Design a protein around this ligand. Structure first.
Ligand SMILES: *[C@@H](N)CNC(=O)[C@H](Cc1ccccc1)NC(=O)c1ccccc1
Length: 215
């Protein structure tokens, strides 16, 4: 694997979004992954719908929580692999209110055929990310409220509570780090992003890493 990767520089990552006052990070993580994978598949970078998952995906629990794996599963097995555009199915749960599911007239932004899980190994995850793009991961963001910038090194790593997106790493730095996309606006952290120490399983980052498959 390369010494450093940043898929943002490859224009493969969309703008930082805002989940608002809603427990829908799982949806943002999954959808982000699908966005990046769709671009890297040879298609235009399209903003996709988190609201599709929050409202329609009943395997998960809307604004109270859910799982990225469950989202990919639901997309393939229930929604024929379709991921709608954010433009034709916009996010509306910003204040905590989830509209009902609508299945007439929406526009398919991406089409996935499956998903893969990555080993609980930062090296193997990086090895994947360097080739096939950004990875949906679960973390312990309990100590993230106070993050303002820099490489976090003593992140509270107890129990998973947040869904974020690995978009790259840097093994060349004095302290090697993961570059992580969050869904807490651009005011938080490093322009919406956060760098965490790589190799010491910070925030339990290596626990649940998955990626969609765009056949
Ligand atoms: C983010 N603000 C919403 N939080 C959750 O959805 C929360 C944490 C989470 C971790 C990994 C992947 C997705 C979400 N959900 C859970 O703790 C959880 C666990 C088991 C079943 C449902 C929800």
């Amino acid at each position: 694997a390369p010494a450093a990767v940043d898929w943002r520089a490859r224009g493969a990552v969309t703008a930082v979004k805002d989940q608002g006052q809603c427990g829908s990070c799982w949806a943002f993580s999954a959808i982000g992954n699908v966005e990046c994978q769709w671009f890297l598949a040879g298609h235009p970078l399209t903003n996709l719908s988190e609201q599709m998952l929050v409202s329609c995906d009943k395997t998960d629990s809307g604004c109270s929580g859910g799982l990225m794996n469950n989202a990919f599963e639901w997309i393939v097995q229930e929604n024929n692999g379709a991921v709608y555009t954010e433009d034709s199915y916009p996010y509306a749960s910003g204040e905590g209110i989830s509209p009902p599911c609508t299945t007439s007239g929406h526009t398919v932004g991406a089409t996935i055929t499956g998903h893969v899980e990555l080993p609980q190994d930062e090296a193997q995850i990086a090895a994947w990310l360097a080739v096939n793009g950004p990875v949906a991961v679960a973390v312990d963001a309990s100590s993230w409220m106070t993050y303002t910038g820099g490489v976090m090194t003593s992140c509270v790593s107890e129990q998973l509570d947040h869904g974020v997106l690995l978009v790259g790493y840097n093994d060349s730095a004095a302290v090697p780090y993961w570059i992580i996309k969050n869904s807490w606006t651009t005011q938080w952290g490093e322009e919406g992003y956060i760098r965490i120490a790589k190799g010491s399983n910070q925030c339990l980052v290596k626990e649940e890493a998955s990626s969609a498959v765009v056949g």
